[PDB]
Design a protein around this ligand. Sequence first.
Ligand SMILES: OC[C@H]1O[C@H](O[C@H]2[C@H](O)[C@@H](O)[C@@H](O)O[C@@H]2CO)[C@H](O)[C@@H](O)[C@@H]1O
Ligand SMILES: CSc1ccc(O)c(C(=O)O)c1
Ligand SMILES: [Mg+2]
Length: 514
Amino acid sequence: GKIEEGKLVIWINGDKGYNGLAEVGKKFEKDTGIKVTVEHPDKLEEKFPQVAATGDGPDIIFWAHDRFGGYAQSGLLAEITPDKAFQDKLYPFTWDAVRYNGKLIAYPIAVEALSLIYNKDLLPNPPKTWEEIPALDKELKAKGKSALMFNLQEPYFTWPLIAADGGYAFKYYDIKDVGVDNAGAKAGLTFLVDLIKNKHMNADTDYSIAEAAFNKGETAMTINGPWAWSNIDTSKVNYGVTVLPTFKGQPSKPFVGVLSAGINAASPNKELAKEFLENYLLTDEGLEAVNKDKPLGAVALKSYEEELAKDPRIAATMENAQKGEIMPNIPQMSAFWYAVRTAVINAASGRQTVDEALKDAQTGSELYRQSLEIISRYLREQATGAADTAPMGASGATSRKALETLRRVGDGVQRNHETAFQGMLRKLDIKNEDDVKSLSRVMIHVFSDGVTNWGRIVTLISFGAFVAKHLKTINQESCIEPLAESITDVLVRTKRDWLVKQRGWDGFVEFFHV
Ligand SMILES: OC[C@H]1O[C@H](O[C@H]2[C@H](O)[C@@H](O)[C@@H](O)O[C@@H]2CO)[C@H](O)[C@@H](O)[C@@H]1O
Ligand SMILES: CSc1ccc(O)c(C(=O)O)c1
Ligand SMILES: [Mg+2]
């Protein structure tokens, strides 16, 4: 392979205690004589799938658990196999966060939730509601201070307000039912936008700016997680950590993350990685070394959490976590976050209205499942000759009309391209599940080139139907669903922006109408 044998390379995000983690690596190195290297690459969560796909990258990847389902689905993670005794050392619900399709795909490290952090010298009694913050900012501005600054560039930080009055990601998971465009989400984001319009916040505020402002005593409040407490300690700001404000009488609902460590499927060092994670890091001493660098939050290791739990900052973290919800770990989470990130930034800046911004995020978040519903149904009915009688469910009008349109347009495409498809198939030689995998790379290569239009998309899906018919004929009907998922994957990740701009499959229906 490409990853070196007999050594460990670990990647972790730059806002975490990577120096403390390096200490743990040194202790492992001292015992074993085996080199451990801790790195904190930029855009880590995007770099890992890029390099791991080629069979390269680190032996161990750290991130919140929401990204790991996508990694596992893409074949990038090893199943982990802790023995019963080790599993019993960590809280069951932390294991639940890293279970994907019935398998454990990472070691859980710690539970993270955003809290309200406030400067007790400026604001001894922090607001219980978001609604009182405009007036509070006016009081503070007279003193040369501001009420609240937090990172507006990452949707993680604005999510608790969006979800407060009823916004949600995926309905508990139906990846076709998304709640980012409902009345509650709209209310939450509008309030944020109004704060900006009324000069109580600045749309350009990012993590570094908000952190510097709070730690310099310029703003009374910020929103952040336990990793941020170390830098505040150093600043000597007199701070407290408490429950997030309510919105319209409802608790803010942070998305709860479990910091987790996965093992690269391509690593020749899986046993070394196991040893390091189970017997060095996930121990009282290992977590303490990391926690002393940047606080982890409520750790997954029971023995050590019983100590941390006595910390009021940790109690506050858990209180907020209990009002929030554990993030899904499904593969669509990345698309969801990118969609909502764009919506918040565009609404904040005025590039889009709140309504249009959240509409696009809805469409972006539902795109994979909506597309899969259509493509899967088309391929299966083409292969078998009979339609699926199951109700379409959520956004059923769109799915149904898109499928109707696809049948009508696809009929001609398959008829006209029949000879071309026969030739393509003979060259590719798709005979089983392994072949459909290889087919993906070919498609991502050819489909990326040239002007995008609905005609070309129908041709891609029509070839899919042609291949599905073939798979059925040679008694490989089980390969049709992974074929549909592969085509959907290619479509959605090469044409995402285009598709959202067309308003997804609604654009498709309108384009070919009558
Ligand atoms: O903003 C979307 C982003 O949110 C979460 O990332 C958090 C992470 O969980 C925290 O540990 C800390 O590093 O802050 C991040 C936000 O900047 C999701 O885990 C992540 O996948 C998502 O993109
Ligand atoms: C298997 S490559 C392929 C198949 C059908 C198509 O329509 C396209 C394309 O349009 O790029 C590519
Ligand atoms: Mg739109």
